Amino acid sequence: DLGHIVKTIRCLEEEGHIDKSFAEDFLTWYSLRATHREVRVVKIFVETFMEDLSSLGQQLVDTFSESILS
Amino acid sequence: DLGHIVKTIRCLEEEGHIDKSFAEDFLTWYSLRATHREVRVVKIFVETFMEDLSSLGQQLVDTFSESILS
């Protein structure tokens, strides 16, 4: 979870939807003072995103592999 | 574009949908020998992903900001 949340927050930050400031605050909050249910809800959001990432990856691989190999 | 493609490929790699090997090959291919149309199609896939990232970011911010602030 924590590893997935950090990786996900990094993706967001790298494209400027959150500033480094919010990233830090989000992670400190998540780790220290997020209630058990708000963690469960964070996990849900991250899981949807993981599914979208899985899909893109499959798409890129499926669509371009043949070309990449030459 | 290129900056967005690299950032996007990094997100994928960080969660093991592609190995560092494919990342490198994908980027070299994209830059050097991807045809103009296959670039247009890559861009489309990346754009869908950018929309999914935008949404997650908004979701996290919208849902948790109040909590993060205390």
Swiss-Prot record, chains A, B:
It is found in: Nucleus; Nucleus speckle. Induction: By cold. Expressed only after a duration of cold exposure that is effective for vernalization. Strongly down-regulated after return to a warm growth temperature. Residues 1-70 are annotated as: VIN3-Interacting Domain (VID). It comes from the Eukaryota. Disruption phenotype: Impaired vernalization response with incomplete repression of FLC during and after cold exposure, due to a reduction in vernalization-induced histone H3 deacetylation and methylation (e.g. H3K4me3 and H3K27me3). Interacts with VIL1 and VIL2. The heterodimer made of VIN3 and VIL1 is required for establishing the vernalization-induced epigenetic silencing of FLC. Component of the plant homeodomain / polycomb repressive complex 2 (PHD-PRC2) large complex during prolonged cold, composed of core PRC2 components (VRN2, EZA1, FIE and MSI1), and three related PHD finger proteins (VIL1, VIL2 and VIN3) that mediates histone H3 trimethylation on 'Lys-27' (H3K27me3). Plays a central role in vernalization by mediating the initial transcriptional repression of the homeotic gene FLC, a floral repressor, after a cold treatment. However, due to its transient expression, it cannot maintain repression of FLC, which is then maintained by Polycomb Group complexes containing VRN2 throughout development. Required to deacetylate histones on the FLC promoter. Together with VIL1, required during vernalization for the modifications of FLC and FLM chromatin that are associated with an epigenetically silenced state (e.g. This is Protein VERNALIZATION INSENSITIVE 3. It comes from Arabidopsis thaliana (Mouse-ear cress).
